[PDB]
Amino acid sequence: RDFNNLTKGLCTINSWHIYGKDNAVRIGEDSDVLVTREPYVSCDPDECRFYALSQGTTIRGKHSNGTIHDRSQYRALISWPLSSPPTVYNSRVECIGWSSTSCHDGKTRMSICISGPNNNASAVIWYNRRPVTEINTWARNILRTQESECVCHNGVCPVVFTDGSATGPAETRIYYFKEGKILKWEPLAGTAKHIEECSCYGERAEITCTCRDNWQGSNRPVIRIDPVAMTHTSQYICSPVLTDNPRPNDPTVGKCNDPYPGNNNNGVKGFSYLDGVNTWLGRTISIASRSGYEMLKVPNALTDDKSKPTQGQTIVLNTDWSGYSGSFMDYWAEGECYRACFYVELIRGRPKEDKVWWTSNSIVSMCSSTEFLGQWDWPDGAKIEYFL
Amino acid sequence: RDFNNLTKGLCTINSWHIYGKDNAVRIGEDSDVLVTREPYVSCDPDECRFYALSQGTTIRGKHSNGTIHDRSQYRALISWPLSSPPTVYNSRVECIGWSSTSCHDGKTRMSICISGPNNNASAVIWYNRRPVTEINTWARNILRTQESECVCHNGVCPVVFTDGSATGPAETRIYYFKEGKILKWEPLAGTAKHIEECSCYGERAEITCTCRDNWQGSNRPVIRIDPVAMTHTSQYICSPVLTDNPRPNDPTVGKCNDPYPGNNNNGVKGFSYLDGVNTWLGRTISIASRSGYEMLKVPNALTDDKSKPTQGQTIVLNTDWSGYSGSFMDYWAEGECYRACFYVELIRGRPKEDKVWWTSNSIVSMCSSTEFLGQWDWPDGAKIEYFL
Amino acid sequence: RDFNNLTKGLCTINSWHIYGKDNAVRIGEDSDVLVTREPYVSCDPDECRFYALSQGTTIRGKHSNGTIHDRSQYRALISWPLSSPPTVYNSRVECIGWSSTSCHDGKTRMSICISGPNNNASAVIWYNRRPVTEINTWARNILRTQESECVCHNGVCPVVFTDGSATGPAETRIYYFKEGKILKWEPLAGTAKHIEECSCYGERAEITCTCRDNWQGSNRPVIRIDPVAMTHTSQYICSPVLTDNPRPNDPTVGKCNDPYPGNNNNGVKGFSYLDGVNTWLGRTISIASRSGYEMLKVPNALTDDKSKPTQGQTIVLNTDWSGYSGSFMDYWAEGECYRACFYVELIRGRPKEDKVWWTSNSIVSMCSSTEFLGQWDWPDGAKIEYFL
Amino acid sequence: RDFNNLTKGLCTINSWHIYGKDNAVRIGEDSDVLVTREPYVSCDPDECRFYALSQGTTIRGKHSNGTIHDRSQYRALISWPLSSPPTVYNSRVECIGWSSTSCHDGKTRMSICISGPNNNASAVIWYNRRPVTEINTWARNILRTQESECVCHNGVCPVVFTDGSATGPAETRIYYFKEGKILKWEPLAGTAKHIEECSCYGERAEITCTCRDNWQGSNRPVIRIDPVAMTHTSQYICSPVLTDNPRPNDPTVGKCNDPYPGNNNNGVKGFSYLDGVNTWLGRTISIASRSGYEMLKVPNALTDDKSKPTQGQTIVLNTDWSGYSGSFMDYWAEGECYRACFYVELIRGRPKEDKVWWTSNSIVSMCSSTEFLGQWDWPDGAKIEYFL
Ligand SMILES: *[C@@H]1O[C@H](CO)[C@@H](O[C@@H]2O[C@H](CO)[C@@H](O[C@@H]3O[C@H](CO[C@H]4O[C@H](CO)[C@@H](O)[C@H](O)[C@@H]4O)[C@@H](O)[C@H](O[C@H]4O[C@H](CO)[C@@H](O)[C@H](O)[C@@H]4O[C@H]4O[C@H](CO)[C@@H](O)[C@H](O)[C@@H]4O[C@H]4O[C@H](CO)[C@@H](O)[C@H](O)[C@@H]4O)[C@@H]3O)[C@H](O)[C@H]2NC(C)=O)[C@H](O)[C@H]1NC(C)=O
Ligand SMILES: *[C@@H]1O[C@H](CO)[C@@H](O[C@@H]2O[C@H](CO)[C@@H](O[C@@H]3O[C@H](CO[C@H]4O[C@H](CO)[C@@H](O)[C@H](O)[C@@H]4O)[C@@H](O)[C@H](O[C@H]4O[C@H](CO)[C@@H](O)[C@H](O)[C@@H]4O[C@H]4O[C@H](CO)[C@@H](O)[C@H](O)[C@@H]4O[C@H]4O[C@H](CO)[C@@H](O)[C@H](O)[C@@H]4O)[C@@H]3O)[C@H](O)[C@H]2NC(C)=O)[C@H](O)[C@H]1NC(C)=O
Ligand SMILES: *[C@@H]1O[C@H](CO)[C@@H](O[C@@H]2O[C@H](CO)[C@@H](O[C@@H]3O[C@H](CO[C@H]4O[C@H](CO)[C@@H](O)[C@H](O)[C@@H]4O)[C@@H](O)[C@H](O[C@H]4O[C@H](CO)[C@@H](O)[C@H](O)[C@@H]4O[C@H]4O[C@H](CO)[C@@H](O)[C@H](O)[C@@H]4O[C@H]4O[C@H](CO)[C@@H](O)[C@H](O)[C@@H]4O)[C@@H]3O)[C@H](O)[C@H]2NC(C)=O)[C@H](O)[C@H]1NC(C)=O
Ligand SMILES: *[C@@H]1O[C@H](CO)[C@@H](O[C@@H]2O[C@H](CO)[C@@H](O[C@@H]3O[C@H](CO[C@H]4O[C@H](CO)[C@@H](O)[C@H](O)[C@@H]4O)[C@@H](O)[C@H](O[C@H]4O[C@H](CO)[C@@H](O)[C@H](O)[C@@H]4O[C@H]4O[C@H](CO)[C@@H](O)[C@H](O)[C@@H]4O[C@H]4O[C@H](CO)[C@@H](O)[C@H](O)[C@@H]4O)[C@@H]3O)[C@H](O)[C@H]2NC(C)=O)[C@H](O)[C@H]1NC(C)=O
Ligand SMILES: *[C@@H]1O[C@H](CO)[C@@H](O)[C@H](O)[C@H]1NC(C)=O
Ligand SMILES: *[C@@H]1O[C@H](CO)[C@@H](O)[C@H](O)[C@H]1NC(C)=O
Ligand SMILES: *[C@@H]1O[C@H](CO)[C@@H](O)[C@H](O)[C@H]1NC(C)=O
Ligand SMILES: *[C@@H]1O[C@H](CO)[C@@H](O)[C@H](O)[C@H]1NC(C)=O
Ligand SMILES: *[C@@H]1O[C@H](CO)[C@@H](O)[C@H](O)[C@H]1NC(C)=O
Ligand SMILES: *[C@@H]1O[C@H](CO)[C@@H](O)[C@H](O)[C@H]1NC(C)=O
Ligand SMILES: *[C@@H]1O[C@H](CO)[C@@H](O)[C@H](O)[C@H]1NC(C)=O
Ligand SMILES: *[C@@H]1O[C@H](CO)[C@@H](O)[C@H](O)[C@H]1NC(C)=O
Ligand SMILES: [Ca+2]
Ligand SMILES: [Ca+2]
Ligand SMILES: [Ca+2]
Ligand SMILES: [Ca+2]
Structure with missing residues (x-):
């Protein structure tokens, strides 16, 4: 109909309820399910769907x-x-590539796929x-993007795109598209030292992205974007x-x-909802591997360098594998506010489970409740032993 | 279009004709059919569909x-x-959970799924x-609902929800929703001692639910609801x-x-159509197990404590497995009255057939005829020996 | 939109062109294809589909x-x-039963399924x-119908329905339905001695059905129906x-x-297009079994007891299996006349090919050309040896 | 809506970007994928789809x-x-035959399938x-057509159709259809000696087809058609x-x-975009077999007998199999010009890979960019060893 406008603020998040779960690997043990990774969720005005980068083969297939x-x-x-597994027969191809992002502007959907050799x-x-x-690539070193929805x-x-070294200073640019055409692009500004895989959401005409500093930071960089002025700034979460x-x-004081x-x-790609006292951070439970997942309410995490959790909810137990996580919201839901949602990629196979030769994932997603x-834990559920 | 109103009464039920049958287990022996249980049927203004709680795996899959x-x-x-089997490729996920109910109000559909640990x-x-x-759970002991359509x-x-002990007094509440929001809720009233898995239907602006007293009754509790006043009462079927x-x-006089x-x-979840002389009860043939299924016309069963059958129809022979059964009606069918329908879950596998390690079901449903x-019997049809 | 009216006459049939073919058994050797028999084709105002009686199991499945x-x-x-195979995932169930007919009246479709024990x-x-x-059954002996589309x-x-003995006089009735309700029914009239599996078509407000005399005739009975007066007559094809x-x-003079x-x-169910000189008969090539299939132009076959072929076209070689055949036409195609079409069921398996334990079929259909x-022959194409 | 008119010219082609890829053979190793060959791409006003001639069996099936x-x-x-593989469950049959072409005129789609014995x-x-x-066939020797979209x-x-010898002079005709009816047909004119498998596109009310001279030419014949006057001429690409x-x-001067x-x-079926300096030719890299694939910008290739490449892009490496290639464009895309696209059939199996008994293909397609x-290479990706 008409372009959507971010006119609402976030609803109060007092907990998280189960939204969708596909049980892809459990079902894939005996169905034509595609091997995937880097999943996410994105909504259209009339439907919310699951998205991911297919590997072009089924889990049980030799490829x-x-x-x-x-x-x-x-x-x-x-x-x-939503909640179906990614099968060879019910999946729709948006575009060809190994890095992507996608979002509906209210009238139609924009999908972006990047492909090529690392240097071209x-x-x-x-x-x-x-x-x-x-x-085309500007730094000739793995042009890459969000791996979750844009807004x-x-x-x-x-x-947000990044091109260049994954272990040093790189060239990150924010492109402002309208109906698929470039209106303008900026080099990254602010204090963030390295940007990768931004997870974004929008409220009250402002877009917030929580990204990943692959080079040196364990705290996450945040990019705030003003889509009207077409400017942005960046910093790190203080908490x-x-x-x-x-x-x-965790230390006693952050940066x-x-x-x-x-x-x-x-x-690891991650996200957060930064909204004053109504702030929730997501993280793996393990400090060593992509294991477990929890959400912690940390009031004023963005600006308070001594902020600590006042509430929490465990999503995946530390004895179960997690992986990437990102934000999305159904901007077309009825209501006075935007209900915050997120997904967690539950990776199975290599490198942690090396008895099988593949790597795939299933998805779990929740949305906020007032x-x-x-709480319950939501693991992938597959038994690797059945694939041997 | 507009909200549906229960303006008609039930058609005269002189017999039952076959409505739908999916042959899920027969077909699942060699197709990607999902393992299910707790099925039911529910109609939209333009289509009637089969519903069930998936187990997140195919029958032939190791999970x-x-x-x-x-x-x-x-x-x-x-x-x-309708009548297709629940396959990995043609099934739509309504919500995530292990207990549910769902109904179309005329404009759109409301689905409710309950999940979590037993105490949360x-x-x-x-x-x-x-x-x-x-x-959230109010009694901290398996919040659960109908397992068939609401009205x-x-x-x-x-x-109707129940929370608390399955073998003693529990806390049952009737929630009145409108467009997904709670308008009001009441504690169970009347003489029913325990309520579980209500099967409901509506006619002439009144909703009747036949439920299950898991604690002490072999006769079924009935809840009559007035959706305009938003009140209800309860008793047991006298027959x-x-x-x-x-x-x-069966004794000579009931309670x-x-x-x-x-x-x-x-x-076992069951149902009945209570309409004066036009009253039909459904029950398993066996008094010991979920075996066989018949429909018996028992005039004034609800109020006559000596009422006995005047006609009947066998649906499933006592040599075949049955299981849950519930009511539904296509409130959007053309006509002067509502045609009563029901489904029977035909459980296969454990616990009765223990040569296999799974438990699943197929469905059979009939509607009334004047x-x-x-009559014919409608068993599941699968040969367990083929799955060994 | 509005009820369709048979306002056109048949186009001139100078030959037959390939319309649809599903290759069901070839594909079913390694796909989830349902076992079927008694197929036919029927059109809606916007789509023509394949129809058949499923056996509730895949070909490769043990059932x-x-x-x-x-x-x-x-x-x-x-x-x-059209032309897809009947798979577990793309098939729609119209109704439950072992005998049927179905047709679109222009506004919507009527499907009729008969089920039950032989006597009820x-x-x-x-x-x-x-x-x-x-x-309900009137003669208590396998109530049965067309096995192809009505008009x-x-x-x-x-x-046209038949109830009673398949090897003696039976009770055939013509029911006139309108929006699914019975307007009237007649007992069979005319000189036909036994009626079964009528194949019908309509032109210029008259409906012609070519049926099967299972009892004593090798020539086919024909029923002409007037859907406005709601009357009919019957005779045999003279040829x-x-x-x-x-x-x-074949003799030199028929009856x-x-x-x-x-x-x-x-x-065997068969059909014909009877239109003066523009008359074409279909028949198996073998006089002994359901083997081969040909179409023969026999001018005035209906009324001329010495009429012989003036042209022909072989559809299936005598070295390949055929089976049932029936008529259908797309009454909603653009044009000045109705293009005659037909399908042939290509049965594979038992009883002729007894190395396998199943019986199924694929379909081939053609339509007329001016x-x-x-010509080409269109056999099923599967190699039974691959199923052993 | 209304008939489409070729009102735009071609966009400037400075390179090619990946458009679609199905990975059919990789996926087919463990999914119900149909064996195909002679694929192409064709768009409707609201969707672009993949097309091909099915072999009526899956790759893994014995047939x-x-x-x-x-x-x-x-x-x-x-x-x-687009980009899905051709599966038994998601494929739509357009018509029955072993040679085809298909195109949308703006209101609806015309598909043409040829079948029969070689002489009839x-x-x-x-x-x-x-x-x-x-x-009907006019020369009684394999009536055949484009194997890619018409315009x-x-x-x-x-x-464009051809009937007669594949290794000598044959009878090629250009048929002008409108709403499926023949408006007129012409015998081939101009200097082309033999025509087969034309790949066509249209711009500024002119249709250009690059075909294949199977008899004696290694340079390609070109047919220019005027769809308003309904005339055409033919010559060879001079380059x-x-x-x-x-x-x-390659020599130093062409004919x-x-x-x-x-x-x-x-x-081998191939194509080209002939547009003055904006001219790009596609060809296999190997001069001996259907191996590799590249696009070369050869300014004025059509008219300049000494024209050589000024730029290029490798699509498939010479170590990977290619096969047929053709042109298509989305005439309904927004924009000031038509974006040139093409597909390449990646044949696997026989005759080159004889360890397997089948022959099939996957598809890769690109469109132009300004x-x-x-560049990246896009091979089929399947490992034949997995099918043994
Ligand atoms: C039914 O459901 C309800 C609803 O879910 C259940 O109730 C929930 O129960 C949760 C489980 O306890 C509870 O979650 C916790 O909340 C804590 C905050 O609560 C306290 O908050 C403030 C401040 O303390 C108090 O004022 C208030 O009264 C509360 O007591 C969090 O602090 C908890 O998180 C911390 O603990 C978990 C492990 O339990 C850690 O995994 C988590 O990471 C947090 O701890 C780490 O990080 C902090 C901060 O840096 C460190 O201080 C701490 O040392 C830990 O650090 C180590 O570990 C991390 C992670 O590995 C590592 O990185 C670091 O380096 C260190 O090694 C937790 O989130 C919910 O709030 C509560 N919800 C509600 C509404 O009540 C109920 O139990 C269920 N019912 C039943 C019957 O089961
Ligand atoms: C073609 O189709 C037609 C249509 O289907 C067929 O006709 C139908 O045939 C049915 C099969 O007989 C018939 O159904 C029965 O109807 C009986 C009622 O009929 C009589 O009704 C009144 C009162 O008796 C009479 O006035 C009237 O004339 C009729 O005679 C029912 O009573 C039958 O149900 C009872 O029997 C079946 C077993 O046959 C039980 O399974 C069933 O549960 C009922 O019996 C139990 O319960 C009663 C009440 O408590 C007890 O009194 C009795 O002792 C039984 O109790 C034991 O068993 C139960 C269950 O296990 C257990 O819980 C309990 O503790 C005890 O152990 C039956 O429903 C249809 O009415 C009839 N339909 C029509 C329209 O005619 C026709 O046959 C078919 N044609 C052919 C050729 O086959
Ligand atoms: C390219 O394509 C074109 C188009 O398809 C091909 O041309 C077609 O070729 C057909 C094959 O010959 C031809 O079909 C035949 O037509 C005959 C009629 O043609 C003659 O008609 C009249 C009258 O004879 C003539 O005036 C006229 O000039 C023609 O000569 C039919 O008679 C043929 O049918 C009979 O033969 C076939 C076997 O060939 C039988 O299977 C068929 O059943 C008919 O014969 C039986 O029945 C008759 C009548 O009762 C008996 O008289 C006869 O003895 C047979 O009876 C025995 O067998 C039956 C069946 O098993 C059994 O029940 C009975 O008891 C007996 O045992 C045949 O239909 C097309 O007309 C022709 N089309 C056109 C437009 O020309 C061309 O060849 C192809 N090109 C190439 C290069 O291949
Ligand atoms: C990142 O991406 C970019 C974009 O893709 C990459 O840049 C591209 O790089 C390409 C690879 O080199 C390059 O493609 C070549 O372009 C040549 C034209 O460039 C020159 O053009 C003119 C005229 O020479 C110059 O004025 C200008 O400065 C350029 O130098 C083509 O000539 C190339 O094609 C020829 O070579 C390839 C093999 O490399 C052959 O396969 C091809 O068929 C051409 O050569 C055959 O045919 C010609 C003409 O008949 C013969 O002269 C020649 O002898 C060859 O003939 C033999 O082989 C053929 C085929 O087997 C056989 O039939 C015949 O009989 C003979 O046996 C080639 O197309 C792109 O233009 C360039 N793009 C851009 C925008 O720059 C960049 O490299 C990537 N970055 C990184 C880091 O990798
Ligand atoms: C968004 O705002 C623009 C004006 O700024 C308006 O034209 C458009 O309709 C608004 N979108 C909606 C959904 O109202
Ligand atoms: C997978 O590939 C590796 C490396 O190519 C090989 O050694 C290994 O055995 C393969 N695993 C399986 C199950 O085929
Ligand atoms: C149901 O009744 C309400 C008024 O009580 C009315 O507004 C609505 O349209 C009625 N529904 C239908 C389908 O008529
Ligand atoms: C199923 O699981 C049980 C318990 O985990 C195990 O003993 C049994 O063998 C399994 N059955 C099969 C067929 O794997
Ligand atoms: C069929 O005839 C009836 C009148 O007899 C008419 O009302 C109807 O519209 C006609 N159908 C069509 C498609 O014209
Ligand atoms: C099919 O069933 C028969 C009769 O029940 C049995 O003897 C036969 O072996 C079965 N065939 C196969 C392949 O199982
Ligand atoms: C194509 O041109 C014809 C007139 O020549 C016109 O009627 C038609 O609408 C045009 N098509 C479009 C899409 O404008
Ligand atoms: C395929 O067919 C040929 C010829 O009919 C036969 O010799 C060959 O063994 C077959 N290949 C396979 C894998 O069956
Ligand atoms: Ca880091
Ligand atoms: Ca009880
Ligand atoms: Ca007979
Ligand atoms: Ca050549």
């Missing part, structure tokens, strides 16, 4: 051997109905299911409650404008 | 081992086209395929024709306001 | 053992897209995908070109009002 | 043995969603999914950059009106 690798000519951004990659922007704009406001959908992985143990040191050249609901 | 268990993080309410469960009410309201009148859809299972043999004693702490049609 | 039997609780009328069967008439009317004119859709199977060899003797108690096209 | 053969009664033109074949033209016109302008869709296969090595000699009786994007 699943080697799916631990991130980039190949056989990957594609696919979407499928290119992004092609699709709008209304047709290719419209193409961008739009009055037709303008900013997207001592560290949310990257691997990471050091607001510098990476908090302790682990170098590694991390009630204080009881 | 089917252990599906005798009722609650896990891998269950979900799924719907699929929560129900989330979805309306128009988006979560809207959440209710609405002018936008108000009452739903000596006992319809729970397991149960004692109207007390459970009829003989079997404790057990039962004609006196010939 | 396919025994599918030679015609009646069970596991059969159902299913439809699927009943037909339930569905209209707009809801059950509307039910008819409607201004809302009235006559259907000496005999079209039932098994049958005697117009009596069965032509030679074979008793057996036959051109004189070259 | 795949022998799929190296081009013509049988089991082939059919099927279409399926016939084409049936379908329009709006109904058969409308039929054409329409104001309702007129020319299609010394030879694009058929097998072929001689404009004669086949360039060197290889007889063989070739940017100078980095």
